[PDB]
Design a protein around this ligand. Structure first.
Ligand SMILES: [Hg+2]
Lengths: 281, 48
């Protein structure tokens, strides 16, 4: 029966009878839902959304995605490889220009929050929706999702900031620091020290190759600091990482005492790190 | 000049003993409950 329903549906799609295809699919889906045949509903709605999107019918496609997500909630669909896979497949067909692209993405992230152990959403899903958001010109949301994503997301996050920096045709220390500091602060906030170090390295490596600033590498006990002669803010930011790692109040205080200005510019961030790593209220 | 001396000495002392948190440290993402404080916007718009 379901196979027959999908066959008739696809036939209407091919004939260009979008309205009828849409109307009939929802009616049948409604029936499955009333019967509590959620798996049947999910398969029908999911394939329907995909068909409309591939046919460039964004309106009907996203409409069914919202329907899919509501049933995911109703059916208490747990976040896992299979449930996420359906969404990832739909995202691949979403035109970054869809008027309601953002709402579709929010719905997907919200479901992954509600039915997973992740307070801010599934990291794997984040890697996918983050790139879609960037394509749709939602840069701050892309950043947030990449920050809360996977290792591949960390690489994409560095590319985002790197490409953005190269966009502004400005290499003043204060400007380069506006980009670099986001990698340092965000990864420190979620305590992913390994990501902080890797992103830091990629970003600085690229900055060096591109602009060839005056610098000298300082290596001690397995740690390295790229001392820039004309980018003191970058020096300070690199030292922040190691300092939080020590969780030593004295070093934190010593670092800030030496970089008074930067400590004022990043006052709010440092206050948070103060409580997070040094237990300073 | 003097900054180089400070950075070098600071790093030497900050790593004299192995830091409480190693470089490979990663708090399980499922255990993160606070994202910190909102960072300021970049002073430029993004060009897609
Ligand atoms: Hg710090």
């Amino acid at each position: 029966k379901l196979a027959k329903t999908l066959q008739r549906f696809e036939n209407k799609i091919k004939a260009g009878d979008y309205y009828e295809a849409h109307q009939t699919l929802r009616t049948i889906a409604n029936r499955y839902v009333r019967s509590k045949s959620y798996e049947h509903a999910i398969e029908l709605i999911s394939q329907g959304a995909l068909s409309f999107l591939k046919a460039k019918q964004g309106g009907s496609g996203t409409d069914l995605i919202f329907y899919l997500l509501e049933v995911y909630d109703l059916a208490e669909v747990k976040v896992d490889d299979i449930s996420v896979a359906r969404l990832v497949r739909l995202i691949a067909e979403l035109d970054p220009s869809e008027p309601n692209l953002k709402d579709v993405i929010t719905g997907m992230n919200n479901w992954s929050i509600k039915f997973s152990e992740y307070k801010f959403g599934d990291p794997y899903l984040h890697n996918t929706i983050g790139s879609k958001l960037l394509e749709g010109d939602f840069v701050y949301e892309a950043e947030r999702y990449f920050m809360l994503g996977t290792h591949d997301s960390m690489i994409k996050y560095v590319d985002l900031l790197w490409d953005w920096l190269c966009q502004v045709d400005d290499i003043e220390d204060s400007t380069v620091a506006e980009f670099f500091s986001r990698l340092v602060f965000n990864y420190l906030f979620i305590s992913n020290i390994s990501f902080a170090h890797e992103s830091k390295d990629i970003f600085l490596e690229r900055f060096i190759e591109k602009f060839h600033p005056k610098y000298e590498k300082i290596d001690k006990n397995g740690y390295e600091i790229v001392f820039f002669e004309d980018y003191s803010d970058l020096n300070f930011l690199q030292l922040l990482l190691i300092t939080c790692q020590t969780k030593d109040k004295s070093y934190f205080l010593n670092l800030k005492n030496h970089y008074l200005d930067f400590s004022q510019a990043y006052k709010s961030e440092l206050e948070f790190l103060g409580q997070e790593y040094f237990n300073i209220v | 000049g003097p900054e180089h001396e400070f950075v070098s000495k600071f790093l030497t002392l900050a790593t004299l003993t192995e830091p409480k948190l190693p470089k490979s440290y990663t708090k399980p993402l499922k255990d993160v409950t606070n994202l910190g404080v909102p960072l300021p916007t970049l002073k430029y718009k993004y060009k897609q």
